[PDB]
Design a protein around this ligand. Structure first.
Ligand SMILES: Nc1ncnc2c1ncn2[C@@H]1O[C@H](COP(=O)(O)OP(=O)(O)O)[C@@H](O)[C@H]1O
Ligand SMILES: Nc1ncnc2c1ncn2[C@@H]1O[C@H](COP(=O)(O)OP(=O)(O)O)[C@@H](O)[C@H]1O
Ligand SMILES: CCCCCNC(=O)CCNC(=O)[C@H](O)C(C)(C)C
Ligand SMILES: CCCCCNC(=O)CCNC(=O)[C@H](O)C(C)(C)C
Lengths: 266, 266
């Protein structure tokens, strides 16, 4: 078997390949010592590593391993998955929404990093905890789906009131900008969580559409584990991408783009 | 006497002009009735209005007023202030960081809107309230000034455990992304608020430097009341603009750009 691993700040993504059969595994970065243990017990023909925690794995295993930069690996795996799933895109921004968010422009042949921002899944988890005391990711995201952002977020129409706004009225003008107007409100953990996902999604999307414009592409591919068990995030991002005239794409096993990619840079 | 009013989502900025010479005043948008009361008693030669709540003013006063579109008014007034303050910038991005944030490219002749985002002053107050239960603006902003983001934000160097990161290790990787690694103890209001100000600054700067690259300018002018009583915000923004190879500018009475521009539009 051949093994690729993308050991990130929060999740370890492990792909095992033998024959044309794949295994897609996810483990916590917290449990990296168990991954190393597991690896040390296997018969591995080829091990390729990428990610911020690649070094940790490499120093604790008993076999050589090639180490790749995660931007190249993500770009390589993503192209493999897009092709498999019938997306033949001439060029695209891809936004990798992990613990943090990294943006890339794929010109049809190779990637360049064109921005990043700290709004991503780590913010969903951290700010989400400060606002709900929930630490369990499934718990946090499930609850967020039951939330309403309306007493938290301010829209363009709330600011322009009964006059014609300069951009469409239903757009968010100020995330959390209605809070001071609803202090009669209680602010439910579900509503607060939905607003945190809301801001993360909007910021990622805004950045993605901006660079799409700059690098003259209409296609935006979103990957990263932050979309898992988070239909609200998927929806925020998808709707706003379409609204600004771009085409969003999600990819089956997109969160493993880097793990796959590592295998095929070797 | 001539009056220009920028009536936004949180604050109403008033410029009074007489012998070529100006007086600046702000009032809360929540106290708009008091602004209307003040206008109705005044003999005014020329009254010009802009911003979201210009409608509400115009429909409650008992005199005429001319209404101008805010994007144009802000551009006109910022060009006046820049020259009065000894700048000769051929072109620039301007980021108007109000209740929310609007971004513009000024080519030397006219402005174009080139994006926006809901991260700005409204988010600082609303998210800041949610994490701190402070509603008083000067109190909320003062509380943040000496906060420590270290237990709250995750940096690139935290994810890249002992290995060399592919981008600068001191960059924020995930705002709030260190929170789950610091559950042992309490998160103080100062530290949480410094983190709020940091995410707003970094998002606004990220957008501003992206569009500066896109439109080929190294100049970025930052306006809006969100910078008032918030030295930390100014610093987050200035430091990262400079690290991205751009030149940041703040303007005395920059928050009155629209009010001034309304007076000088024809
Ligand atoms: N089982 C899970 N546990 C924790 N976080 C998860 C899980 N599934 C998805 N997530 C989301 O995915 C994020 C990490 O995305 P990922 O793309 O794996 O990033 P990284 O490579 O930086 O670890 C988390 O910050 C969280 O928002
Ligand atoms: N006295 C104040 N009261 C409330 N907010 C203030 C005050 N001074 C500055 N601010 C900040 O300025 C932000 C609004 O900036 P401004 O440029 O006036 O926006 P708008 O035109 O949308 O009112 C507020 O959201 C708050 O962050
Ligand atoms: C100080 C403002 C800096 C905000 C910009 N930050 C970034 O570009 C890093 C965002 N994070 C990411 O790209 C990913 O989490 C990696 C893993 C660090 C590549
Ligand atoms: C659905 C996500 C939309 C995010 C983009 N939102 C915007 O561009 C509105 C940002 N706000 C502003 O530009 C200002 O607050 C005004 C006053 C609405 C012009």
């Amino acid at each position: 078997m051949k093994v690729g691993i993308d050991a990130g700040g929060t999740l370890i993504k492990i792909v095992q390949e033998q024959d044309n059969q794949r295994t897609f595994k996810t483990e916590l970065t917290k449990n990296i010592d168990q991954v190393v243990e597991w690896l040390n017990q296997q018969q591995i023909e080829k091990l390729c590593l990428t990610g911020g925690n690649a070094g940790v794995i490499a120093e604790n295993i008993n076999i050589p391993a090639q180490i790749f930069v995660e931007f190249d690996a993500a770009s390589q795996g993503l192209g493999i998955l897009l092709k498999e799933q019938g997306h033949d895109l001439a060029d695209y921004i891809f936004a990798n929404v992990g613990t943090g968010t990294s943006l890339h422009y794929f010109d049809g042949q190779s990637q360049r990093r064109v921005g990043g921002i700290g709004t991503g899944g780590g913010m969903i988890q951290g700010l989400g905890y400060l606002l709900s005391q929930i630490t369990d990711y499934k718990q946090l995201t499930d609850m967020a789906q039951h939330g309403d952002r309306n007493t938290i977020d301010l829209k363009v129409r709330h600011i322009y009131k009964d006059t014609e706004p300069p951009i469409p009225g239903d757009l968010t003008a100020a995330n959390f900008g209605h809070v001071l107007h609803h202090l009669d409100a209680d602010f439910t953990p579900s509503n607060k969580l939905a607003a945190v996902i809301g801001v993360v999604g909007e910021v990622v999307t805004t950045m993605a559409i901006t660079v799409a414009r700059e690098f003259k592409t209409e296609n935006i591919v979103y990957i990263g584990s932050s979309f898992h068990n988070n239909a609200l995030l998927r929806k925020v991002v998808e709707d706003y991408t379409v609204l600004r005239g771009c085409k969003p794409y999600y990819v089956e096993n997109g969160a493993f783009s880097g793990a796959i990619g590592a295998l095929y840079l070797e």
